[PDB]
Fold:
Amino acid sequence: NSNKELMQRRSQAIPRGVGQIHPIFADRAENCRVWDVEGREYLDFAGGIAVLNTGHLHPKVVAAVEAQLKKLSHTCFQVLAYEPYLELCEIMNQKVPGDFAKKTLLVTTGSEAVENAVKIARAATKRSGTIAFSGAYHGRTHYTLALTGKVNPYSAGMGLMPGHVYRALYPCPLHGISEDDAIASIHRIFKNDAAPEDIAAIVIEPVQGSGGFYASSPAFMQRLRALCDEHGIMLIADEVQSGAGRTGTLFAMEQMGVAPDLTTFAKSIAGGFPLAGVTGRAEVMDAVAPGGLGGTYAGNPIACVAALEVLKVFEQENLLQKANDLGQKLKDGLLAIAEKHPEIGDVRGLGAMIAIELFEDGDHNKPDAKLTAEIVARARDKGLILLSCGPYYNVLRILVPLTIEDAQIRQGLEIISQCFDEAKQ
Amino acid sequence: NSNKELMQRRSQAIPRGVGQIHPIFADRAENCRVWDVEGREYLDFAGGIAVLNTGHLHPKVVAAVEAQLKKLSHTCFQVLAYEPYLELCEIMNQKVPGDFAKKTLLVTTGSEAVENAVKIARAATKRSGTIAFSGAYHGRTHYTLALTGKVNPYSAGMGLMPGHVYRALYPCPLHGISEDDAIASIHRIFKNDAAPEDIAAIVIEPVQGSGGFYASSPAFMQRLRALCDEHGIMLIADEVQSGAGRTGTLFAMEQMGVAPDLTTFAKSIAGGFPLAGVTGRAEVMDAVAPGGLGGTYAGNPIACVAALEVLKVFEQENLLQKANDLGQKLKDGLLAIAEKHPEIGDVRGLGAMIAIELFEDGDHNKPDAKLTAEIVARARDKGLILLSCGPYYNVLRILVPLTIEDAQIRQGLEIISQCFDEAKQ
Amino acid sequence: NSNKELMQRRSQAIPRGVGQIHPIFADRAENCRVWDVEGREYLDFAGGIAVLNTGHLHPKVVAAVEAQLKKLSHTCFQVLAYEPYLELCEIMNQKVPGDFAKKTLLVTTGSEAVENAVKIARAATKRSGTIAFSGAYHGRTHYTLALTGKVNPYSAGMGLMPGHVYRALYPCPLHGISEDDAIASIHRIFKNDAAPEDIAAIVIEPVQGSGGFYASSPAFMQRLRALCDEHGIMLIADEVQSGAGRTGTLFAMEQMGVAPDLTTFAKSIAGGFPLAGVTGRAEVMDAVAPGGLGGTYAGNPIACVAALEVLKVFEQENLLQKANDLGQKLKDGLLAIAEKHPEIGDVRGLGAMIAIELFEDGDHNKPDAKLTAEIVARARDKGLILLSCGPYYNVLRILVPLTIEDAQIRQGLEIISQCFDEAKQ
Amino acid sequence: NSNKELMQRRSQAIPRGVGQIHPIFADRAENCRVWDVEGREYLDFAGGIAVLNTGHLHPKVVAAVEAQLKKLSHTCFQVLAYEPYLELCEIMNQKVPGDFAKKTLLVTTGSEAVENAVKIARAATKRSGTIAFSGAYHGRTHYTLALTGKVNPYSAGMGLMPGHVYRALYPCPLHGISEDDAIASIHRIFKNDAAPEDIAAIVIEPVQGSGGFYASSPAFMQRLRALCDEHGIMLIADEVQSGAGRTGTLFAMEQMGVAPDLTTFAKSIAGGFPLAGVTGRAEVMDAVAPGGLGGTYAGNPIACVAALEVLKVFEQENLLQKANDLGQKLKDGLLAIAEKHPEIGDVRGLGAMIAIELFEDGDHNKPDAKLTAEIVARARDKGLILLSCGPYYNVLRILVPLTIEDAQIRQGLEIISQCFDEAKQ
Ligand SMILES: Cc1ncc(COP(=O)(O)O)c(CN)c1O
Ligand SMILES: Cc1ncc(COP(=O)(O)O)c(CN)c1O
Ligand SMILES: Cc1ncc(COP(=O)(O)O)c(CN)c1O
Ligand SMILES: Cc1ncc(COP(=O)(O)O)c(CN)c1O
Structure:
């Protein structure tokens, strides 16, 4: 077939609303390699957007999936239960940070995970409002669009999203927002628009993904934890992207020295299959009356075993450790590039959640959304699949599977090195 | 390895909010048969809630999945596209009622589907309000919970869901709501709370699911269509549960005599794998700006080929036909047991979407909810998995796979027969 | 100094949003008489919209007001208190129906009264939702427009008004809506959009004003009281228009057999001066924290002494008894005019809150809005100021001062008779 | 006839929600003097809260009031028009800054004004959102409470107020908020929660009253003007308190260098009688369909003539000029008392809108609400009525009539001085 031929049909059958980063149709993939319908091979650094921390179709994961496929694919837990769902919950309850009893709900998409986390926080505290941070991303349902700190294009032309969501400033010294500023912004909400007694939860990404890979410091999370504690507000850690080991630990919160009340997870949790969930303080999770929580596909059988296997593979294969190594390699590699390309104004990242911000002529005030896109474009023509993000589209985030070999690591770095040289000429 | 023991583990690991219709754990299934961890075999008349119209792990579908499983399971379409997604959209564009160009978007869940169809309608009309009907069910997200016409237990303790969702009366003579009343109830909204110019769309289930399997007549649907046409209101047909040939036609709207501007689908579409989508008037679908639509697992690769394979199966095994028969057989068998039992006040159903509503002493004023629950429990004792529904939890709805053998149908009616005769001794 | 001339200046300096029922500039008035800038005299049957029950410039009221002008006109009660405010509250605490301790807050307009009654009901119950009825009118502020069961023209073109206000049907048998349907419409909200525990109050007009002068029956009002009681919902009675003894009792609720938790009042309470208030169960009133209620002009000194004087008149001049007699004289006179003209399909009203509803050929489903508007126009030509109301604008309501002359009663009815004759001619 | 006796009666008849700054009952007043029911004479430095810039019962104003009182007090302009209303609008149309044609709507309270200003902006832009500033105050109706940047106590226990109101930062270097930060806070809203095209207006006090008397600079207001121009957003200026000559010019905006699209006025416009309004771009004002703007008491006759006379009094008595002289003297006298007491960390104000902020040990981080509150008590014992304000209740504002005599200005400063000295040991 042909990529362009498939793109033409795409434009005829699918709405333009559905964006398309790379105009390539994949055919097969394996770990870090992807082959398009034209037979061309690529080194995947987007990882399906952090969904493949274990790589494309990890064998142990596929094996489990094939086995379950001989048994059953769906029943809808709420009608007839099944062990995989039960077993995954039990494991999340103990792996998700929190020195106390927890319970886990399994849904299907990261959006639904956040939707439920807030629902549960509201039923628990008996309050309606929530607070979210600038540059945050939490999903594409009406309510999660309101939580998401970005209107364009996610809400464009649709009108105002749900109310009673209040905006706080995410800490980010790189741009003049001090942890004191972030904390102050929360009190501002309490004083100006919504008293604590009306705030059911504060939703935050320990490390923002779509936001441009900006991380919270242990100190700030601790203050946030104290503030929430003082007002009986549930702290929700959206770990949909930062979770499943991307930061060096299974969940980023672990590195914050403090525990959330509720945690959402998805993407890499199932290494390539549709699964999401909420894990939180047991009594909070139970605040909802029976029949209150649910969903048809929720905690799908095949995805459950894949999740279980992903968790096994993480231990058997030492991914958490590799996640740190990989980040250090990419970070050193990228810094070597930064010594001959001032346009790269910052190399940051926790574990393997690495990213670089492109500024025009060094200046930390001139986002280069054009060079960024050029780098992506050039990178693709060289067989490297990259992704960008951040409120000013000048951030390159690397989400390559943790299972990547050193050769592919050097390979990718090299390709990114040229993209810049060939882009200054 | 015991249902009881697993149920106890469940209470310690999973929230009570996730209801449990049957305290049984399924180990494996095949078409209409299901075996638990203990070994007991049941006959599934619930089909994972209208999800398995082609039966559990249908052989042709399973092979397709297995094939795709060797290639890839996820890339995130908006990043790297793939043919199965593109192909299905093309077929749905042709399969969904409406003699005009259409475009399709693939999401993951029925909730996401309705969510996007509303976003789409809003962007297209530049309006924020929506009208849904009493007894409707559209999802467990904040917004789809507002759309759903039932607070308990879906919203209990959570507070009020997003506003700007107005309630209309779903036509239902069996309870005193004439079609005229229904259309009038819509004019009431226009006069009292939200003018037509502020209503983006009117969402409706051609045939309500949890609502009690009540169906709209072509006449009504037609006035509804004319009313929307007059005001530029997008008519949304939520066919998440009525679709996939459950009523005889692939979509219930086909039998209504008019096309909707937007249609949502899920459940049986992929016969047991996580997938959902929205098909609508091309002009409308494109109203959303590029990058405004999308979800991480959207139109999952494996789920897609399963759906493609399910559509082939429908055409090859005449499932649309078997549905109409199966439905007729059920009605008759039930109408029979209704002779000896006045408790069965009504036996209705479109295609294979059949149901019976139990009443206290044949009194259409006293909904016998306790009797309903009684039969459910009794059928399970005799190996039959049934489901109840309706605003008064007094309705029994059959969602048995269309691929059920003639014997299992008698075997089914017999079991239900026993239950009624035994509950009356 | 010409009407037409002043109207041209109007269009030039005042917004057209401010509708002008009669293109006339009143220069002076006295009891039921009004003279325009051209010197023409009119008989006032609108009464400034139920604001002048004691007539234009009642001698006793004006005298009281003049005395107060010599002392002070404003201080802002919450800053420096004054006695007229205090005295009026003590009196309202006794006069407002309800056999138990009460407390009163004084604001300035009817809309503020309703705003404050809901605020109070919310603080007292810890709930946010409210239920109002079809055809209801509660004010022009954002929230009260939401409560008002009429979008056009009040909130026309402004987008949707505040959410979390649900709509119930007002009992109106003339138009096929039984008290059973009305109560039922409330349970429908409880099951479909807002559970009792989220509803702070049910706001209702004992007799709808703008809504068509449709009155509630004691039987209905009673079922409503028990309903609220069962769910701890505050029953708010908006008597801004039905109050001030327009129905035969100081407050219409007195005739219902039950007492509300809160009652709003304005218009006639002060006989032509800016004043309004909320009276209710003491414990409910005190629910709002200190400093939570207030308003610059609230309970203005002149308005208060004016209201104190209005109350004496009602007592000294047997106005309630007069309201009842006046009502009968009017209805009988109207009933006679109807024996000739079939168009008049209804003649109703408690006390002096009288109105007639016109139909096309007496077809009780053909609101003859055109004729209603014509009768108004004709009456104006004959020196009779009238007002139409009702959802379909086919209702003429009489709000002539209770201090009307026997002769003016004959004259009003006569002019009306002429209008229906000269029109049907 | 006893202050305490009346306070006792108040506690039994009126809800505690209604605060009480001074537990004194005024009997009569004249210009800047008030006498309680016990005969004690105080000097009024609060002015009914900026409502009496022409003093208590200004002889000219009263005379005007009495004349109208002989003609008519109410008709409801919507029903029968009258000249005082028309005439006042024409004068307002030309007095309010703006080289374009303007139209004026008259209502009754400042809350109604802001409410109406927003409805008009909404119809004109066909947008629903609004932006307001931190520490702002706009009224006590539901919607105006949401606009108001202060939850406590204005809405405690009540729950969340209407949404789709976003918060921007009011510029205030004295406390860290720069003009750039304020402008940045608005873009932030545009980027995170509500796009410019969904924002109908930006509401702002040229000089925050309740907020603590912080003035906006011309430069800042100009950037705000340009920003609204760029996005078709109506700029609403709330001059309810800053209006009517308090700042040295009739409207504070005159001193800003730009014109708003809409202006709300109240308080001192009528010198002690219930009246408020909205004056704005004519075509904006006319966006509301006829019949969409009303209010029973709206632009009351007596109050209208009072405003017309007040405006005349400002001219013949040179109040604007006196306002500036009064401000200077006060500020000089206060800066004097500020040399013996470091608690007075700031002396500010435009014209006669003067306020002093008290910090602890002159620590611009230690708001001394205790002292501030203590100064008010001592002052009242010395026959002087004062008021406090500010988000931290550490600001003393002076709203004494501009008609104050020179000796009364000394008397006031001497007393205020005597209050700070005595509060030292
Ligand atoms: C932090 C975060 N939260 C929620 C979501 C939404 O999840 P989904 O795309 O699976 O709906 C994403 C998606 N990239 C995310 O990064
Ligand atoms: C009509 C209808 N709409 C939407 C949904 C939500 O779909 P899901 O459970 O897959 O989220 C359902 C599920 N029972 C449904 O029946
Ligand atoms: C029942 C009722 N409530 C509230 C209002 C509003 O009162 P106001 O015009 O004084 O704000 C009216 C009058 N239009 C009314 O009739
Ligand atoms: C800027 C401002 N806006 C609105 C209002 C509300 O005015 P009112 O109390 O007359 O309703 C006030 C008065 N506290 C005010 O100072």
